[PDB]
C-alpha cells in the first residue's frame, strides 16, 4: 500500500470554495436595489448542496469570501469614484434595514465588512454556530404539532423538514457611497468553504434535479440512459 487517500478525506472533499449566492446592489438616484438582503444558506446552488447532502449530519467551521464586480449601466460619459460596499450580518432577532441609510447600518454590535472596490475579495471565517451538536441537512419532522385543542388548523401548521424560519439570519449588502450622477450596478458573489468538517450518517447522492429546499422532486425523474443488457 503506497497509494494514499489524502485527497478523498472529508476535509479535502470540501476544501474548495463554492459559490452560494449572487447579490445585485445598485447605486443610483434614490422599486430599487440600493440594499439587498440575502438569507444565508447553501441551497441556492446545487453543487455544494449535493456534496453536503452526501451525509445526514455535519459540523464545520465556515469561510466566506466575497467577490464584487461592478459595471456601468447605459453610461454615456458619466463616471464614478471607487465605491465602498458594506456587508452587514443580521442574525435572527436583530432589526433589518428598511432603507440604504437606515440606523441599522451603524453596526454597533452586528459584525460588518467594509470592502473597497478593486481590492482583494473580502474573506472572513465563522465558527460552528449551530444550536444543536451538529447541523441537520435532513430533518424528518416539523417544528409545530397540530393539537386537538387548537382553535384552527393554522396554529400548528408547519412546513415539513423545516426547523427554523430564520435559520442563521441574512446578509445586507449596500453601497456606502452616495449616488453618483450615473448608475453603477455591482454583483457580490459569496463563496463558502467548509473547514474542519466532520460528517455523520452517509446518504446516497441526489439523482434528480433539486426542487426547493427539501427532498421534493418535480421533473427530470428519468436519470439513467439507455444501454444494451449484453452490450459492453
Amino acid at each position: 500500500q503506497r497509494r494514499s487517500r489524502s485527497e478523498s478525506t472529508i476535509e479535502s472533499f470540501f476544501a474548495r470554495g463554492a459559490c452560494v449566492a449572487i447579490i445585485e446592489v445598485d447605486n443610483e438616484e434614490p422599486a430599487q436595489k440600493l440594499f439587498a438582503m440575502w438569507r444565508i444558506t447553501y441551497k441556492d446552488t446545487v453543487q455544494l448542496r449535493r456534496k453536503l447532502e452526501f451525509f445526514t449530519y455535519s459540523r464545520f467551521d465556515m469561510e466566506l469570501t466575497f467577490v464584487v464586480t461592478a459595471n456601468f449601466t447605459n453610461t454615456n460619459n458619466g463616471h464614478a469614484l471607487n465605491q465602498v460596499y458594506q456587508i452587514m450580518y443580521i442574525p435572527p432577532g436583530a432589526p433589518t434595514p428598511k432603507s440604504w441609510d437606515d440606523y441599522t447600518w451603524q453596526t454597533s454590535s452586528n459584525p460588518s465588512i467594509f470592502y473597497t472596490y478593486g481590492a482583494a475579495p473580502a474573506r472572513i471565517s465563522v465558527p460552528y454556530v449551530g444550536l444543536a451538536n451538529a447541523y441537520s441537512h435532513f430533518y424528518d419532522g416539523f417544528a409545530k404539532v397540530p393539537l386537538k385543542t387548537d382553535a384552527n388548523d393554522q396554529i400548528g401548521d408547519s412546513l415539513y423538514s423545516a426547523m427554523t424560519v430564520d435559520d442563521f439570519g441574512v446578509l445586507a449588502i449596500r453601497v456606502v457611497n452616495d449616488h453618483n450622477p450615473t448608475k453603477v450596478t455591482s454583483k457580490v458573489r459569496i463563496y463558502m468553504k467548509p473547514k474542519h468538517v466532520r460528517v455523520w450518517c452517509p446518504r446516497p447522492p441526489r439523482a434528480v434535479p433539486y426542487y426547493g429546499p427539501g427532498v421534493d422532486y418535480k421533473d427530470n425523474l428519468n436519470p439513467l440512459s439507455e444501454k444494451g443488457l449484453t452490450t459492453y
Binding site: 469570501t65 443580521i90 442574525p91 435572527p92 432577532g93 436583530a94 432589526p95 432603507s99 441609510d101 437606515d102 440606523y103 441599522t104 451603524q106 453596526t107 454597533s108 454590535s109 452586528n110 459584525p111 460588518s112 465588512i113 467594509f114 470592502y115 473597497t116 481590492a119 482583494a120 475579495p121 473580502a122 474573506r123 472572513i124 454556530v129 444550536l131 444543536a132 451538536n133 417544528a143 409545530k144 404539532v145 393539537l147 385543542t149 408547519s158 426547523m163 427554523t164 424560519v165 430564520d166 439570519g169
Partner: protein, 235 residues
C-alpha cells in the same frame, strides 16, 4: 525585501476584527484607576439581578405603574388562572423589556435556567395558597389547575412566606435556544392558579396586588452578540 503574498481579505475593514493600530497620542500619562464600587466583569451578572416583570399589559394598564401589579382577590374565579406567559425571556412582551430580556436582545442564542420570584403585597391578615407551574413545551398550554398540576410546580403559602421562588430548570432539545420567537426552540409556559383561595378577615382589604421578578441563574449563558431592536434612531 522580504517577499510577501497578499492574501484575500486585504484592505478590508471588519468591525469585529482585533488588530493593533498606531497610537495617535504617544507617551500619554493616563489617569490611574481607583477602586470604584460596582465593577461589572460580565453582562450576565446584570441578568442574574432580579427585576420586576410587567405582568399586566392591558390597554388601560400598560406603560404605567399598574402594569407591574397583578390583582389577587378572594372574590376571584378559582378555576381561571391568575397569570399566564410563555417562557421566552427575550421575545415575550412581559419578559422582553426586563433587564434579563434587555441583555438577551443583544444576543442571538441563550441557554440556562430561569428564576421567577413572586412577591405578595397584601395585608398580614391575608392568607392563601398559590400554585405556580412551569409546563415544558409540546402539549396544550395549561388552561386549568388540573393540567398545570401535571407539569413542574410549587405551592406558595401567602401567610407564611410573602415571596416564592419558582426555578425553571434548563430542559431543551437544543443546547441553545434563540432569543426570537421560534416554535422549534420554544421554552414552555408559566401559569399561576389559586390552590385554595385568599382568605381575609373583616376590616381588611379584600383585593391585593402581587409583583413578579425574573432573573437568570449561574448556569445562564448567551451567544452571538447582535443589535437590539428596542432602540431606534430617526435617520
Amino acid at each position: 525585501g522580504l517577499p510577501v503574498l497578499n492574501t484575500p481579505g486585504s484592505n478590508q475593514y471588519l468591525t469585529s476584527d482585533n488588530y493593533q493600530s498606531p497610537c495617535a497620542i504617544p507617551e500619554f500619562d493616563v489617569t490611574p484607576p481607583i477602586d470604584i464600587p460596582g465593577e461589572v466583569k460580565n453582562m450576565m451578572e446584570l441578568a442574574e439581578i432580579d427585576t420586576m416583570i410587567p405582568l399586566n399589559l392591558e390597554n388601560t394598564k400598560r406603560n404605567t405603574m399598574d402594569m407591574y401589579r397583578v390583582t389577587l382577590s378572594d372574590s376571584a374565579d378559582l378555576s381561571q388562572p391568575i397569570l399566564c406567559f410563555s417562557l421566552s425571556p427575550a421575545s415575550d412582551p412581559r419578559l422582553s423589556h426586563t433587564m434579563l430580556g434587555e441583555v438577551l436582545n443583544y444576543y442571538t442564542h441563550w441557554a440556562g435556567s430561569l428564576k421567577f420570584t413572586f412577591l405578595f403585597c397584601g395585608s398580614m391578615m391575608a392568607t392563601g395558597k398559590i400554585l405556580v407551574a412551569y409546563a415544558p413545551p409540546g402539549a396544550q398550554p395549561p388552561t386549568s389547575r388540573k393540567e398545570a398540576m401535571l407539569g413542574t410546580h410549587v405551592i406558595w403559602d401567602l401567610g407564611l412566606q410573602s415571596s416564592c421562588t419558582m426555578v425553571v430548570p434548563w430542559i431543551s432539545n437544543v443546547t441553545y435556544r434563540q432569543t426570537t420567537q421560534d416554535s422549534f426552540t420554544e421554552g414552555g409556559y408559566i401559569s399561576m392558579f389559586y390552590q385554595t383561595r385568599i382568605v381575609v378577615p373583616l376590616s381588611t382589604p379584600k383585593s391585593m396586588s402581587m409583583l413578579g421578578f425574573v432573573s437568570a441563574c449561574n448556569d445562564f449563558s448567551v451567544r452571538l452578540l447582535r443589535d437590539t431592536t428596542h432602540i431606534s434612531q430617526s435617520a
